[PDB]
Structures are given as structure tokens and as C-alpha cells.
Scaffold this active site. Structure first.
Site, PDB file in Angstrom:
ATOM      1  N   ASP A   7      -2.498   0.943  -3.472  1.00 25.33           N
ATOM      2  CA  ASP A   7      -1.233   1.484  -3.941  1.00 25.33           C
ATOM      3  C   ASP A   7      -1.275   1.817  -5.421  1.00 25.33           C
ATOM      4  OD1 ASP A   7      -0.090   0.777  -1.385  1.00 25.33           O
ATOM      5  OD2 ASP A   7       0.007  -1.281  -2.156  1.00 25.33           O
ATOM      6  N   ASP A  23       1.640   2.852  -8.107  1.00 24.13           N
ATOM      7  CA  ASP A  23       3.073   2.970  -8.342  1.00 24.13           C
ATOM      8  C   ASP A  23       3.382   3.352  -9.766  1.00 24.13           C
ATOM      9  OD1 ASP A  23       4.958   2.361  -6.209  1.00 24.13           O
ATOM     10  OD2 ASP A  23       3.684   0.566  -5.956  1.00 24.13           O
TER      11      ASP A  23
HETATM   12  C1  J1D Z   1       2.750  -5.885   0.394  1.00 24.92           C
HETATM   13  C2  J1D Z   1       3.340  -5.991  -1.022  1.00 24.92           C
HETATM   14  C3  J1D Z   1       4.861  -6.042  -1.087  1.00 24.92           C
HETATM   15  N1  J1D Z   1       2.872  -7.285  -1.588  1.00 24.92           N
HETATM   16  C4  J1D Z   1       2.113  -7.335  -2.700  1.00 24.92           C
HETATM   17  N2  J1D Z   1       1.737  -8.612  -3.151  1.00 24.92           N
HETATM   18  C5  J1D Z   1       0.966  -8.607  -4.221  1.00 24.92           C
HETATM   19  N3  J1D Z   1       0.507  -9.787  -4.805  1.00 24.92           N
HETATM   20  N4  J1D Z   1       0.557  -7.522  -4.889  1.00 24.92           N
HETATM   21  C6  J1D Z   1       0.863  -6.209  -4.495  1.00 24.92           C
HETATM   22  O1  J1D Z   1       0.419  -5.311  -5.178  1.00 24.92           O
HETATM   23  C7  J1D Z   1       1.700  -6.162  -3.324  1.00 24.92           C
HETATM   24  N5  J1D Z   1       2.062  -4.918  -2.895  1.00 24.92           N
HETATM   25  C8  J1D Z   1       2.859  -4.844  -1.873  1.00 24.92           C
HETATM   26  C9  J1D Z   1       3.273  -3.455  -1.494  1.00 24.92           C
HETATM   27  O2  J1D Z   1       3.709  -3.158  -0.386  1.00 24.92           O
HETATM   28  N6  J1D Z   1       3.124  -2.548  -2.534  1.00 24.92           N
HETATM   29  C10 J1D Z   1       3.443  -1.136  -2.432  1.00 24.92           C
HETATM   30  C11 J1D Z   1       4.889  -0.982  -2.043  1.00 24.92           C
HETATM   31  O3  J1D Z   1       5.767  -1.764  -2.389  1.00 24.92           O
HETATM   32  N7  J1D Z   1       5.160   0.100  -1.234  1.00 24.92           N
HETATM   33  C12 J1D Z   1       6.536   0.323  -0.795  1.00 24.92           C
HETATM   34  C13 J1D Z   1       7.239   1.144  -1.871  1.00 24.92           C
HETATM   35  S1  J1D Z   1       6.848   2.777  -1.817  1.00 24.92           S
HETATM   36  O4  J1D Z   1       7.830   3.473  -2.556  1.00 24.92           O
HETATM   37  O5  J1D Z   1       6.438   3.135  -0.493  1.00 24.92           O
HETATM   38  C14 J1D Z   1       5.348   2.908  -2.750  1.00 24.92           C
HETATM   39  C15 J1D Z   1       4.735   4.308  -2.673  1.00 24.92           C
HETATM   40  O6  J1D Z   1       5.630   5.392  -3.109  1.00 24.92           O
HETATM   41  C16 J1D Z   1       4.933   6.352  -3.921  1.00 24.92           C
HETATM   42  N8  J1D Z   1       5.393   6.112  -5.296  1.00 24.92           N
HETATM   43  C17 J1D Z   1       4.682   5.769  -6.489  1.00 24.92           C
HETATM   44  N9  J1D Z   1       5.499   5.606  -7.530  1.00 24.92           N
HETATM   45  C18 J1D Z   1       6.776   5.814  -7.011  1.00 24.92           C
HETATM   46  C19 J1D Z   1       8.019   5.761  -7.593  1.00 24.92           C
HETATM   47  N10 J1D Z   1       8.123   5.428  -8.932  1.00 24.92           N
HETATM   48  N11 J1D Z   1       9.137   6.043  -6.835  1.00 24.92           N
HETATM   49  C20 J1D Z   1       8.967   6.324  -5.503  1.00 24.92           C
HETATM   50  N12 J1D Z   1       7.829   6.405  -4.838  1.00 24.92           N
HETATM   51  C21 J1D Z   1       6.737   6.129  -5.633  1.00 24.92           C
HETATM   52  C22 J1D Z   1       3.410   6.018  -3.757  1.00 24.92           C
HETATM   53  O7  J1D Z   1       2.900   6.750  -2.704  1.00 24.92           O
HETATM   54  C23 J1D Z   1       3.483   4.445  -3.564  1.00 24.92           C
HETATM   55  O8  J1D Z   1       2.388   3.949  -2.884  1.00 24.92           O
END
Ligand code: J1D
EC number: 2.7.6.3
Length: 158
Positions: A95, A97
Site C-alpha cells: 500500500d 497512501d
Molecule cells: C490491514 C491494515 C488496516 N493494517 C495495517 N497494520 C499495520 N501495522 N500496518 C499497515 O500498514 C496496515 N495497513 C492496513 C491497510 O489496510 N492499509 C491500507 C488501507 O487502509 N486501505 C484502505 C484505505 S484505501 O483508501 O483503500 C487505500 C488506497 O486508496 C488509494 N489512496 C492513496 N492515498 C489516498 C488518499 N489520500 N485518499 C484516498 N485514496 C487514497 C491507494 O490506492 C491506497 O492503497
């Protein structure tokens, strides 16, 4: 513009992936990396029985528009990761972000900046605080203050 980007992966051996991503970030047009945080080994937010994540933050200098930047980070995610990065509570192949984009506030179908949940996620806040301890959000909130208020556990380095 300085954009701050969070990286996570919980591949069992994620360093090569994370390096591939960092190189790809630097190769984005009209952009270059200013600074990279240490790499941190963080317990899963979600089911404890997956590998730990590697988290880091990157400062990226860019003259791209925010949605153009997102186009690239999403491209990198497709090229470097798989639909592990999409299982809701993990695992996550990779990911990227966008946490902050200059001092802009963005609320569109594609983008929420500042990032929608970073204030609840010590694994995003602590690496950011390493590289930008004086950071102030667009609304005047202070990164340091959020960490002080919430008392999120310090992270272990990878
Ligand atoms: C599984 C989970 C929660 N647990 C974690 N535990 C630990 N220790 N460390 C982690 O890094 C970690 N990451 C996690 C996880 O799911 N992370 C990614 C996440 O949240 N995805 C859901 C949210 S999402 O908008 O689709 C992310 C996605 O939206 C896009 N994006 C990037 N920046 C953005 C923004 N500012 N606004 C909108 N979209 C954007 C991009 O494709 C990103 O992957």
C-alpha cells in the site's frame, strides 16, 4: 510541493518489495524523494496471525497535481503488489497512501487529504514524526500533539 506518503507491506520478507516501491516513487515524473523514514516492524491492525507489516514514510517533492500523483502510486501498487494489498484486514502486498499533499485539503471521490484515518494509526504517525516532527496539518493540528494526546506505542525498527 512536498507530499508525504505512507508505505506498508506485510510480505514475509518485505524489504525487496519496499525498495522496489521506493525506487518507483523516485522514478515518478517531475518528482523526487527528499527523505525516507526508518523502516518499522509493526503488529497487524487486524488479525494478529499474519506477518508483521513494514511501515515507513517518504517525503516526495513533486510538481504533479494530487490526482496525477495518485495515478502513479496506484500504478506502482498494481505493478509491485497483488490483491493481497486489498484484503481488508490484511495481508497487504503493498500500500501507498498519500498522507499530506503540501498544505492542501482534498475531499473528492478519489482522494481524501489529509488521509482519512492516519490520526488513528500510530504506524502512519510515528514514521511521519521521524521525518517531520514539526509538521502542522492544514487545519492547524500538530503531528506532535496528536501523538501526545493519543499516546500511541512507539514502534520497533525493522
Ligand atoms: C490491514 C491494515 C488496516 N493494517 C495495517 N497494520 C499495520 N501495522 N500496518 C499497515 O500498514 C496496515 N495497513 C492496513 C491497510 O489496510 N492499509 C491500507 C488501507 O487502509 N486501505 C484502505 C484505505 S484505501 O483508501 O483503500 C487505500 C488506497 O486508496 C488509494 N489512496 C492513496 N492515498 C489516498 C488518499 N489520500 N485518499 C484516498 N485514496 C487514497 C491507494 O490506492 C491506497 O492503497
Amino acid at each position: 510541493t512536498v507530499a508525504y506518503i505512507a508505505i506498508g507491506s506485510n510480505l514475509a520478507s518485505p524489504l525487496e518489495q519496499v525498495n522496489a516501491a521506493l525506487k518507483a516513487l523516485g522514478d515518478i515524473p517531475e518528482s523526487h524523494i527528499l527523505t525516507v523514514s526508518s523502516f518499522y516492524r509493526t503488529p497487524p491492525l487486524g488479525p494478529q496471525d499474519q506477518p508483521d507489516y513494514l511501515n515507513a514514510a517518504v517525503a516526495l517533492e513533486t510538481s504533479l497535481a494530487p490526482e496525477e500523483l495518485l495515478n502513479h502510486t496506484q500504478r506502482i501498487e498494481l505493478q509491485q503488489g497483488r490483491v493481497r494489498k486489498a484484503e481488508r484486514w490484511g495481508p497487504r502486498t503493498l500500500d501507498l497512501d498519500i498522507m499530506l499533499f503540501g498544505n492542501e485539503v482534498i475531499n473528492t471521490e478519489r482522494l481524501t487529504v489529509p488521509h482519512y484515518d492516519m490520526k488513528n494509526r500510530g504506524f502512519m504517525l510515528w514514521p511521519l514524526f521521524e521525518i517531520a516532527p514539526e509538521l502542522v496539518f492544514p487545519d492547524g493540528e500538530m503531528l506532535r500533539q496528536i501523538l501526545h494526546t493519543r499516546a500511541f506505542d512507539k514502534l520497533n525498527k525493522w
